[PDB]
Write a protein that binds this DNA or RNA. Structure first.
Ligand SMILES: [Co+3]
Ligand SMILES: [Co+3]
Lengths: 255, 255
DNA sequence: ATTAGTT
DNA sequence: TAACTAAT
DNA sequence: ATTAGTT
DNA sequence: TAACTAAT
């Protein structure tokens, strides 16, 4: 009854996340970075219609808001099947170029697994849904990610931007990790007898007894939901001795 | 009166050389080297006629002799002007490939000049004419350099080879150096007060006083001629304080 | 007449 | 992955 | 619609 | 010096 007891912990029934303990993130520019406004590319009506639903709900979620910036980058309609079913994808490459770098705190997977004792044979693997959107963007920096939203077949607005850390931003991964490591510190302390592996949106908890593993998973789920994060209950793995994580298959401590 | 007193020392009036103190050189093959016979390329009558004079005189000098080998490499007619005036040039590249390597004893020019004191401001520069031909080839190894000599416009012989170290052989330079260093050892000993720079065919003697420099040049010339070497009196430099050597201009010790 | 070798 | 230069 | 980047 | 693949 996991999905049951932790309603606010799952994306499926907890609703959009929002890391409240985190202060709006400010994105430092390079000393010589000056705004770049690239005009939106033409888009077949089918494509424009394909991404409309998303945009809409994002606006409704206050994740996208109307604005006016000297910045502006194109929006690209991508698909997976033959070519149907589109997804909005913004090309932030020029913004990334003008943004200030930061030290990659994220530990590569291999060494990340190094810190894993055989003593803990029980696993739980969670992955957060829309990890980035849980982190607020400081108003000052929000202008950097604006893009133009039109609709020749429906008058429609103009330029919109993000209010949360966006997809395609070269530092979202690193910025998110740091954030989560900060927010899961208290947990690590309150459960010295557990091993929490953290790699951005991908989490791994390991314990000695399947009993602990479960008690651990609850404290964790309770905490995640509490702090404002949501994990995909769908693709989740709870209390096992064989679990697939970061592309490695964990079996008794193999891979 | 230099050309005068050392007749046997100059190519111009000493005649072909022959290092007698040297034992016929044997060229060691690689463990897996098996003979290669490449058929001669067609040659315009003009070209064949252009190189005839040389060949002839080489045969007359006993430097080229008739033979019959399983080896055989093409002969190429090369020129310098627009394209007239040809010179026989043999392509020994395949033979070099099948010949055993040896340690490059020749010191590169730069470090070669390193061993040169400022105290010696007087220079003499000689260069040997047909350096390689002064070294005899052991009968056993002579077969390696055979090539086919025809003449559709004059019945003519067939296959001929060298009796002396040939041009285009990847080890002639090194083999020659060693030889000359061996033959000029006694001189170095008998004239501790001189500096002899040796780089294959290119020699440089240096002394303190222009007087020594001259006395030195004589002992040297007498020795060269004696041993069987000939220097091009033509392009020679005797007793100077500024002499061009190995591509460096020596002035008071510059370059 | 071929070739080792180099943006 | 598209010739060219020296050099034998 | 562009692009970093790789025999 | 002759395209192509992922990826935003
Ligand atoms: Co070049
Ligand atoms: Co590739």
């Amino acid at each position: 009854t996991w999905l049951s007891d932790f309603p606010q912990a799952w994306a499926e029934t907890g609703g959009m996340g929002l890391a409240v303990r985190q202060a709006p993130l400010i994105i430092p520019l390079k000393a010589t970075s000056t705004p770049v406004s690239i005009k939106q590319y033409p888009m077949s009506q089918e494509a424009r219609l394909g991404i409309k639903p998303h945009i809409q709900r994002l606006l409704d979620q206050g994740i996208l808001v109307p604005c006016q910036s000297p910045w502006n980058t194109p929006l690209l309609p991508v698909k997976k099947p033959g070519t149907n079913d589109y997804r909005p994808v913004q090309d932030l490459r020029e913004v990334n170029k003008r943004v200030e770098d930061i030290h990659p705190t994220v530990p590569n997977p291999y060494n990340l697994l190094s810190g894993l004792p055989p003593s803990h044979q029980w696993y739980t693997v969670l992955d957060l849904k829309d990890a980035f959107f849980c982190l607020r963007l400081h108003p000052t920096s929000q202008p950097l990610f604006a893009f133009e939203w039109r609709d020749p077949e429906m008058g429609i607005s103009g330029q919109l931007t993000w209010t949360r850390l966006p997809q395609g931003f070269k530092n979202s991964p690193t910025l998110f990790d740091e954030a989560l490591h900060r927010d899961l510190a208290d947990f690590r302390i309150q459960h010295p007898d557990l091993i929490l592996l953290q790699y951005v949106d991908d989490l791994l908890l390991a314990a000695t007894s399947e009993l602990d593993c479960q008690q651990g998973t609850r404290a964790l789920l309770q905490t995640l939901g509490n702090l404002g994060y949501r994990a995909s209950a769908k693709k989740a793995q709870i209390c096992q001795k064989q679990v697939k994580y970061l592309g490695y298959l964990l079996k008794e401590g193999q891979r």
